[PDB]
Amino acid sequence: KNVTLTIRLLMHGKEVGSIIGKKGESVKKMREESGARINISEGNCPERIITLAGPTNAIFKAFAMIIDKLEEDISSSMTNSTAASRPPVTLRLVVPASQCGSLIGKGGCKIKEIRESTGAQVQVAGDMLPNSTERAITIAGIPQSIIECVKQICVVMLET
Numbered sequence: 001k002n003v004t005l006t007i008r009l010l011m012h013g014k015e016v017g018s019i020i021g022k023k024g025e026s027v028k029k030m031r032e033e034s035g036a037r038i039n040i041s042e043g044n045c046p047e048r049i050i051t052l053a054g055p056t057n058a059i060f061k062a063f064a065m066i067i068d069k070l071e072e073d074i075s076s077s078m079t080n081s082t083a084a085s086r087p088p089v090t091l092r093l094v095v096p097a098s099q100c101g102s103l104i105g106k107g108g109c110k111i112k113e114i115r116e117s118t119g120a121q122v123q124v125a126g127d128m129l130p131n132s133t134e135r136a137i138t139i140a141g142i143p144q145s146i147i148e149c150v151k152q153i154c155v156v157m158l159e160t
Contacts, residue, residue, distance in 0.1 A: 003158065006053045007063070008094035010136055013047035018073045019066055020048075026069065034062030045136075046092065056154070063150065067143060090140040092123070100124065100135040103153065114152055120145040 011019070020027045031038040036054020043049045052062055070089070095103070104111045104124075115122045120141025125132070139149050 001055055001057065004053075004055050005059055005154070005158075006051075007059060009050040009052060009066070010043065010046045010092045010094045011048055011050075013043075015070075016046075016048035016050065019050075019069050021069065030062060030065050030069075033065055034058050036062055038062065049094065063147070067147065071143065088120075088140045089143055089146060090123075090138055091146055092136050092138040094134055094136050096134055097132075100137065103137075114149060115139075118145050118149040118152065120149055122149070 009016075021029070027038075034052070034054065036052055036058030038053075039051045041049040041051055050066075052059060054062075102110075111122060118139075118141070120139050123136075123138030123140070125134075125136040127135070139146055141149075
């Protein structure tokens with residue numbers, strides 16, 4: 001209704017699976033409530049990638065829904081696995097080379113100040129020789145810290 005955007009979610013088949021939801025009825029519910037083009041792709045690295053596209057509002061709900069699904073799962077009494085030792089929450093997003101380069105800014109002053117206050121740590125994919133095109137960033141920390149990093153990067157992206 002106001003402005004459109006695009007966000008590529010990259011996660012491990014296991015983590016993303018918990019987010020997908022049983023019988024895919026949850027992912028169906030996610031889209032219906034999001035309103036922004038939500039799809040899935042491959043990932044020799046992550047295995048699962050959710051391509052979301054749509055106005056800031058649609059995306060706002062989607063991101064809030066997916067994060068909640070992960071919050072409900074962890075706090076649902078895991079009846080499997082043996083300890084995780086991962087108090088924080090990591091989310092690896094995808095972005096073009098131009099996005100990562102600028103997102104970092106001169107001497108990383110930009111990305112540094114963002115993660116410095118956000119309280120979370122941002123990750124960056126490698127680039128062995130001139131082959132890689134898209135860079136994957138991994139933000140770990142508190143759910144509040146993550147949503148903050150996304151809101152800060154988004155607002156700055158539009159306001160350039």
